[PDB]
């Protein structure tokens, strides 16, 4: 193949010089699992148990017992294919092409097929890692003209049936009206019997800014962050809490747990990008080229994702 | 078309909610690691204290008698059981298979102790209990003795569960 | 007034950030691109680039060239140049096109989504008559007096 | 089966692929061995 | 019960009505083995005669305007298409993937020769053919030059299928 598939040879190569995706630091290693298909549907059903009456006593002779119970739940998740097109050079026309510092046409914006891919690459997996985290495909800052997906295909933010709590415009700078939110939010959180689990926070920088002031007359030796910290111990049993900051986030807090139990991703086996066997080629020097990734597979357990939206009006 | 889904819906729940275990697909797992109050449920079969020698028969049925009071019927094909109770009552209904619509049912003279449909939520613990027309259990002429011990528990609109032991027949 | 800028940058470019990353005048082609598609080149007369393109007809020693235009010759859509040879690459008017084109610079904040556009003498499209093109955006003002705009032109209508 | 192994050499363009999943499952299981919070 | 089981089949056919292909459980085989007037059905997508180098584009649809004439309305969302015609035609949708909710559609400045939904069955051969405010076609204000080739096909109530050829537009 690589004898015969220039292309193909040249991903080969050029596959190592790809960075790793940001949402992976999101997740624990137990959250992600693999899955193995393209587009569809996938069912997993959960079987619990339960008792159905007090437990019966063991003396002299006793044929009527109690029972205990079953029951399941099966949850549907959609999944979805897409692909880009990208233009480059015919590999036999880059020698016209090749000059002492650089491999391209600058005047007509002309790469070599490694280079192409490289860069083009590195774009899908921007776009994979804003719909992870925000549920949502756009590639416009405003954040509208997006693109209408499947149902049972949700993010992070946009989960359903999730904890969200709205901080008032006037009180947008008043870090002890986004701290009483956040209790709030906290308080009406339901782990059930999972809440000894390690705990991931989610800020945009500018709230991250916020955080570092010391805490507030006001005091020293201690900051709005390590306040954060020491409210959400309260709650996951005394367990560790990891924070990070997102760019793609703003004005908004995330606050989820880091158990597989509740949160789960399983993505398809080929959601990151993908080369195409189809080539298109002409007279010209100028061919084109494929990329395929996959979207979908985010399961989470209902009312354990803590939304905090800061309203800038 | 958008209508007609809507109305298919509305239809899809109205069916599905008389039904044993009716399947759908939710998009988020449901949570309950509180072990207590986890089994008054519509799909919870049987009785909360079966014996290894109680006597069960499968029957077919007309209409949907899960959890309630079953009478015989003769009508051509054989006789089947349907929901109902008075002086005809024959056993009650415990389990139910609707793929091959048959219903697993405990004679009147085994006693039961389980969760049965009540008429209303006017029923509390120690009051005796008759079946209606329709196999409902309501408040109390009692040709069978059935006592409430527990109060009457909705899950649905008109789904009510109570506890009762039933230990035959009065005189 | 050229597909790159003449002057050079003193800054190199932040390539951060993927959204909103495509509104420069040096994005060639179209959007959408289909590989079936027919595409043509002509010797160009003046700079017809991201405009509408009619035929020019000089005495008869030289072959016929392609003029930015439109109305009732229109030929097609000039979406490419190279500049080194002086040509230019149109897409037919029979065939789909679907990308950003020069807008007038008149009324441009009068120009939404979905609103009808024709092409004017100079090859400029402008809210409207015998030319199929809906703009699919808002206009993008990329200097003083160079406007872009997404547009969708399938075709001549009736 | 990864792209990784220089002594591996696919065949065809289905097992390019499969190549190139488990290359992206050994980077993944690499970087959270060496993740530290 | 019985009434709840009767409406949801009266919905579910309904609903079904307006599908591509309808997923219908048959208790027998049907009979096919003639080989002439296979092709007049619901489900055949696509056209009867296809080129290679035909352009093809997908988008989101609203509505079902499977084999009829399509118009871009923009709303925040992506433009979608939707069922209509008159002046503001874009194209012809010929296939929809129901999972995805997308549909393909030809653009009106290529070619097509197929089937395609017809107002009703009052269309005979070498008729002049216009799209209605529903994407139906209709006989003869015809911006767009369709001529008919066979006569209106009935398969249900209201599918009405007829042989059409596209080929642009008047002046």
Redesign the interface.
């Known amino acids: 193949?690589?004898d015969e598939?220039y292309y193909?040879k040249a991903?080969?190569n050029i596959?190592?010089e790809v960075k790793?995706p940001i949402m992976?630091?999101w997740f624990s290693?137990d959250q992600?699992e693999?899955v193995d298909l393209q587009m569809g549907y996938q069912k997993t059903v959960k079987w619990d148990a339960f008792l159905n009456a007090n437990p019966t006593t063991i003396a002299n002779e006793v044929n009527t017992i109690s029972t205990i119970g079953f029951s399941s739940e099966v949850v549907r998740l959609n999944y979805l294919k897409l692909q880009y097109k990208f233009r480059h050079l015919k590999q036999t026309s880059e020698k016209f092409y090749t000059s002492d510092s650089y491999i391209g046409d600058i005047n007509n914006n002309l790469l070599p097929f490694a280079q192409a891919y490289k860069l083009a690459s590195s774009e899908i997996i921007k776009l994979i890692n804003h719909f992870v985290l925000t549920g949502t495909v756009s590639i416009q800052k405003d954040g509208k003209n997006q693109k209408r997906l499947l149902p049972n295909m949700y993010g992070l933010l946009n989960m359903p049936e999730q904890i969200k709590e709205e901080v008032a415009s006037g009180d947008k700078d008043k870090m002890d009206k986004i701290f009483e939110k956040i209790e709030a939010g906290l308080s009406k959180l339901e782990l059930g019997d999972e809440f000894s689990t390690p705990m991931m926070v989610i800020v945009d920088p500018a709230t991250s800014l916020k955080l570092v002031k010391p805490y507030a007359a006001a005091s020293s030796c201690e900051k709005w962050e390590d306040v954060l910290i020491q409210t959400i111990k309260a709650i996951n049993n005394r367990e560790?809490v990891?924070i990070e900051t997102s760019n793609l986030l703003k004005h908004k807090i995330l606050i989820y747990p880091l158990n597989s139990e509740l949160i789960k991703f399983k993505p398809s086996?080929?959601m990151?990008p993908?080369p195409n066997?189809q080539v298109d080629k002409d007279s010209t020097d100028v061919a084109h080229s494929y990329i395929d990734f996959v979207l979908g597979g985010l399961l989470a357990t209902r009312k354990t994702i803590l939304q905090v939206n800061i309203k800038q009006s | 078309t958008t209508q007609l889904v809507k109305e298919y819906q509305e239809k899809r729940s109205k069916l599905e909610k008389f039904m044993k275990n009716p399947q759908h697909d939710a998009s988020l797992l449901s949570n309950s690691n509180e072990f207590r109050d986890k089994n008054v449920e519509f799909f919870a079969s049987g009785g909360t204290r079966t014996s290894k020698f109680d006597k069960l028969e499968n029957h077919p049925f007309l209409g949907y008698p899960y959890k309630r009071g079953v009478k015989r019927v003769i009508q051509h094909y054989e006789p089947h059981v349907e929901a109902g109770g008075g002086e005809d009552l024959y056993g009650i209904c415990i389990d139910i298979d609707e793929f091959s619509k048959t219903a697993t049912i405990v004679p009147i003279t085994n006693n039961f102790e389980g969760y049965l449909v009540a008429k209303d939520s006017t029923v509390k613990v120690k009051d005796k209990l008759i079946f209606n027309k329709d196999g409902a259990l309501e408040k109390v002429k009692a040709t069978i003795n059935a006592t409430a011990l527990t109060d009457a528990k909705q899950i649905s609109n008109e789904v009510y569960l109570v506890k009762v032991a039933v230990f035959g027949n009065k005189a | 007034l050229m597909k790159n800028p003449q002057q050079d940058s003193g800054l190199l470019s932040n390539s951060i950030d993927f959204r909103d990353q495509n509104l420069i005048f040096s994005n060639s082609g179209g959007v959408c691109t289909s590989s079936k598609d027919k595409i043509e080149n002509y010797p160009a007369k003046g700079y017809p680039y991201k405009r509408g393109v009619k035929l020019s007809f000089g005495d008869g020693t030289t072959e016929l060239e392609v003029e930015a235009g439109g109305g009732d010759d229109l030929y097609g859509v000039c979406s490419d140049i190279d500049e080194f040879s002086g040509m230019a690459t149109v897409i037919p008017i029979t065939n789909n096109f679907t990308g950003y084109l020069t807008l007038k610079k008149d009324g441009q904040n009068g120009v939404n989504p979905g609103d009808k556009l024709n092409f004017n003498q100079h090859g400029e499209l402008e809210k409207v008559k015998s030319v199929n093109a809906i703009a699919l955006s808002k206009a993008h003002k990329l200097t003083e007096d160079l406007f872009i705009v997404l547009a969708s032109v399938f075709g001549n209508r009736a | 089966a990864s792209?990784?192994d220089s002594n591996f050499?696919?065949?065809?363009?289905t097992?390019?692929?499969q190549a190139?999943?488990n290359?992206?499952?050994q980077?993944?299981?690499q970087?959270?061995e060496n993740?530290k919070?």
């Open positions: 193949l690589f598939n193909a991903v080969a596959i190592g790793d992976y630091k290693p992600i693999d560790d990891y086996k080929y990151l993908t066997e | 792209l990784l050499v696919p065949i065809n363009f097992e390019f692929v190139i999943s290359t992206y499952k980077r993944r299981i970087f959270y993740l919070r």
